[PDB]
């Protein structure tokens, strides 16, 4: 609506509804989710697969003085 | 509302015959309904032949043509130093939009004589070969010429990297703000490129005006003018600018095409004639200014990629005659692996001496000439058979020196390094060595000085120039170093 901020309201209460759903704003739904699932997985492909919610730890060694 | 609006009288071919808005201020970029701007080039009475920014697929006819009421300007500022924009100075970087929100008519002209000031400048490329043999001063329009990213493009980088030293130095003249007008250069090409420049972080003092291999033709076309407007800002605001137009070959193409589609002919080579004016108008605005302009510069590096070395090629002839020289690069040499690859015979600064750096000149000035002969006997003489030692040497030496003008891409230099390695050859030290070892020598030679003769470098740097003394120190370096360098 064009007391223009009412079009922000027009949007905004549907943000209010959506964010005042769950996930914050959802209704994006499973189709979004398969899309996510690929790129979120695909990310891991570039990027390695382990402690993306914990700390990775590492190791230190030598072959020989060739 | 639609208060004063006009209807697209006709559309086809991205040429919008526009009915109405009639009293359009000339070369107003107007806005159509479609978001799209066009600029109302052609005032026919009954309509406006409108060059369309964006493209005709979108379009539907009778559509509202709104004045934008604005004459083509492009944003100007400096926050673009640190940015990639499209030609309209709108981002494409996707960082959100540039802080540069000033706009400036691209409709501007090249200053007069009195405003201008001649060169006496050096302008350092960090490409030894270049600053030496095609010595560069600031303000200059000069043709970069070479054949299909034959490292052509590479060159621009090394220079830019060299300007790093200035913008990362504090230069009050050498602080060359790079404006990279990317013409036609595919998104990949650019994307790629940019990625590097940013890495070269040179992007910070750098505008990238971007017409990739996606643009509406006027856009590609426009891009330089955009750049043109901006660089003069620096120039005139004392700041010292560098614009790379890469390349006008495509721009022109678009432009001719634009004419042609406008069912306006061309002339020669299918190209319209005042494309000469195009480049002139574009390029004359790159200049070396008087002090009123803060003295500054817009140094123009147009790039034309020869097509098959062809330059007689009207438009190349044009550009050549505008440029105060060309750097033709010997592409086969490039391909021989020779990077730089130069066709130095075909690389000229008619100028010569106003554009050089004394440090270098002291070894290089002299060298250039001497090389003139080496090269001369590289070509002149040509058999199996030997001449005399002098010349044989010149060839050998020359050949060594040839390595020296190479520079594995993306590795420019500050003046002393260049001079340094050069001293080694000029002054006889590495006639001796071989190319295989030249390259090696240099590496070593640099680490040697890097470590040690930092003093000397210090000096050379200081004077901006050589001293016999420094030389004497050098003399020692080379000899000794040379000895270290093998054994």
């Amino acid at each position: 609506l064009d007391p223009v901020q009412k079009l922000f309201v027009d949007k905004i209460r549907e943000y209010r509804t959506k964010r005042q759903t769950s996930g914050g704003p959802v209704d994006a739904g499973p189709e979004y989710q398969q899309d996510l699932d690929r790129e979120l997985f695909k990310l891991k492909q570039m990027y390695g697969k382990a402690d993306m919610n914990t700390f990775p730890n590492f190791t230190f060694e030598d072959p020989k003085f060739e | 509302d639609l208060e004063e609006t006009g209807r697209v009288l006709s559309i086809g071919d991205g040429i919008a015959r526009v009915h109405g808005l009639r009293n359009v201020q000339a070369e107003e970029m107007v806005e159509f309904s479609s978001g799209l701007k066009g600029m109302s080039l052609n005032l026919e009475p009954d309509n406006v032949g409108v060059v369309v920014f964006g493209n005709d697929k979108l379009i539907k006819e009778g559509d509202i043509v709104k004045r934008t009421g604005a004459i083509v300007d492009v944003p100007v500022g400096e926050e673009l130093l640190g940015r990639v924009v499209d030609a309209l100075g709108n981002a494409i970087d996707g960082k959100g939009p540039i802080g540069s929100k000033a706009r400036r008519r691209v409709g501007l002209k090249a200053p007069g004589i009195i405003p201008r000031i001649s060169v006496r400048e050096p302008m350092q490329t960090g490409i030894k070969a270049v600053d030496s043999l095609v010595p560069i001063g600031r303000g200059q329009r000069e043709l970069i010429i070479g054949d299909r990213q034959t490292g052509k493009t590479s060159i621009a980088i090394d220079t830019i990297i060299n300007q790093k030293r200035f913008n990362d130095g504090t230069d009050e003249k050498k602080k060359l703000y790079c404006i990279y007008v990317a013409i036609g250069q595919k998104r990949s090409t650019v994307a790629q490129l940019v990625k590097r420049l940013t890495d070269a972080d040179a992007m910070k003092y750098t505008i990238v005006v971007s017409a990739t291999a996606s643009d509406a033709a006027p856009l590609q076309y426009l891009a330089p003018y955009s750049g043109c407007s901006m660089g003069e800002y620096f120039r005139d605001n004392g700041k010292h600018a560098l614009i790379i137009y890469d390349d006008l070959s495509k721009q022109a193409v678009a432009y001719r095409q634009m004419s042609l589609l406008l069912r306006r002919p061309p002339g020669r080579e299918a190209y319209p004639g005042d494309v000469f004016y195009l480049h002139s108008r574009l390029l004359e605005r790159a200049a070396k200014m008087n002090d009123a302009f803060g003295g500054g510069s817009l140094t123009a590096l147009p790039v034309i990629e020869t097509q098959a070395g062809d330059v007689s090629a009207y438009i190349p002839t044009n550009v050549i005659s505008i440029t105060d020289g060309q750097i033709f690069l010997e592409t086969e040499l490039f391909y021989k692996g020779i990077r730089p690859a130069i066709n130095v015979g075909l690389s000229v600064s008619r100028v010569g001496s106003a554009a050089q750096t004394r440090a270098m000149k002291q070894v290089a000035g002299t060298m250039k000439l001497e090389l003139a002969q080496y090269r001369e006997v590289a070509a002149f003489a040509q058999f199996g058979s030997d001449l005399d030692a002098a010349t044989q040497q010149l060839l050998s030496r020359g050949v060594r020196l040839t390595e020296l003008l190479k520079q594995g891409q993306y590795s420019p230099m500050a003046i002393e390094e260049q001079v340094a390695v050069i001293y080694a050859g000029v002054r006889g030290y590495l006639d001796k060595l071989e190319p295989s070892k030249i390259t090696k020598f240099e590496n070593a030679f640099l680490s040697h000085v890097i470590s040690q003769h930092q003093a000397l470098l210090g000096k050379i740097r200081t004077d901006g120039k050589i001293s016999e003394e420094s030389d004497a120190k050098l003399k020692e370096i080379v000899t000794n170093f040379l000895a270290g360098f093998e054994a």
Partner: protein, 167 residues
């Protein structure tokens, strides 16, 4: 030759290159209005085929088409220079084109001083407006009609789309 005279609207010429003749011609001699009405008349006096459709029929000899279509008939009271211009559009085949000249014309003594701004719905409605003063508002009030979403819409009139248009 003559010198330029053009009633308010005025026009662009071109299928009105004639109009403009009479935008100087009618105008001059100031049977401006005589003809102004003539034209109106003509419009439907025209509109039915006959000795007109005659032209279409290529094979009817323009020569005598004028002497039939305009001899008995289009001079029925359309004559001054009016039959002669008929007989000109006639020659110059601008007869099928004539409506548009009227269109063009007719914004002429009245509508000559028309009303333009492009304005939502049944937009302007060629009248008269005096640019120094507002005239706008008035009009709007008069009505509480038109169609404005179907007819010109809240996107123009007030951007329904724009909020979409930013993203």
């Amino acid at each position: 030759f003559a010198k330029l005279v053009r009633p308010p609207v005025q026009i662009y010429g071109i299928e009105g290159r004639y109009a403009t003749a009479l935008y100087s011609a009618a105008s001059k001699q100031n049977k401006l209005e005589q003809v102004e009405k003539e034209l109106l008349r003509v419009g439907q006096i025209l509109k039915e085929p006959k000795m007109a459709a005659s032209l279409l029929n290529p094979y009817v000899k323009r020569s005598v088409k004028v002497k039939s279509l305009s001899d008995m008939t289009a001079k029925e009271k359309f004559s001054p220079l009016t039959s002669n211009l008929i007989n000109l559009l006639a020659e110059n085949g601008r007869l099928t084109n004539t409506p548009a000249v009227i269109s063009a014309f007719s914004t002429m003594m009245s509508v000559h001083r028309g009303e333009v701004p492009c304005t939502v719905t049944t937009a302007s409605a060629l009248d008269e407006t005096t640019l120094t003063e507002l005239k706008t508002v008035l009009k709007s009030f008069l009505s509480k009609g038109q169609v404005l979403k179907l007819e010109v819409k809240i996107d123009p009139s007030i951007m329904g789309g724009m909020i979409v248009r930013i993203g």
